[PDB]
Amino acid sequence: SAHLQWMVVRNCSSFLIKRNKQTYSTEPNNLKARNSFRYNGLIHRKTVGVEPAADGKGVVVVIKRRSGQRKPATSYVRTTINKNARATLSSIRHMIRKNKYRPDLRMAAIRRASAILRSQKPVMV
């Protein structure tokens, strides 16, 4: 159960960073990379995560399959997005709002995607 698991990894986890009066958590699919019950990519039955692609073009959107909760090999299905930045956010927004798949990270998911696209274009001097 998500709440029961949260009370265990609340303060004792290998992904927990406590430093400079700030706390961060580094599990793979965690938007905002913060220690919170909402933004934890491990203890929920369904999670949403966006990562940069294998190469520096586009983002990879991964969401958690409903059935294989105890089979991490097939628990996550990943899709890659390599359209325009506006197309990416529109595409991602539909995965969450239209599917009703955790409609609380919708705003968070777009923010992380926009940050990732900024890192893929060249930086001027």
Does residue 82 belong to the site contacting another protein (CB under 8 A)? no
Task: Count interface residues toward another protein (CB under 8 A).
Answer: 11
Q: Which amino acid is at 63?
A: I
Q: What does residue 36 show for φ and ψ, rounded to 5 degrees?
A: -155, 155
Does residue 92 belong to the site contacting another protein (CB under 8 A)? no
The answer to whether residues 69 and 76 touch, using CB atoms and an 8 Å cutoff, is no
Does residue 98 belong to the site contacting another protein (CB under 8 A)? no
- Name the one range near another protein by CB under 8 A: 4-12, 47-55, 75-83, 109-117: 109-117
Cβ at position 42, least distance to another protein in Å: 23
Q: What does residue 26 show for φ and ψ, rounded to 5 degrees?
A: -120, 30
Cβ at position 90, least distance to another protein in Å: 7
User: Of 60, 95, 51, nearest to 80 (Cα)?
Assistant: 60
C-alpha–C-alpha distance, residues 118 and 73, integer Å: 31
Per CB under 8 A, the list member of 5, 91, 114, 120 interacting with another protein is 114
Q: Which residues in this chain contact another protein in the complex, by CB under 8 A?
A: 84-86, 89-90, 110-111, 114-115, 117-118
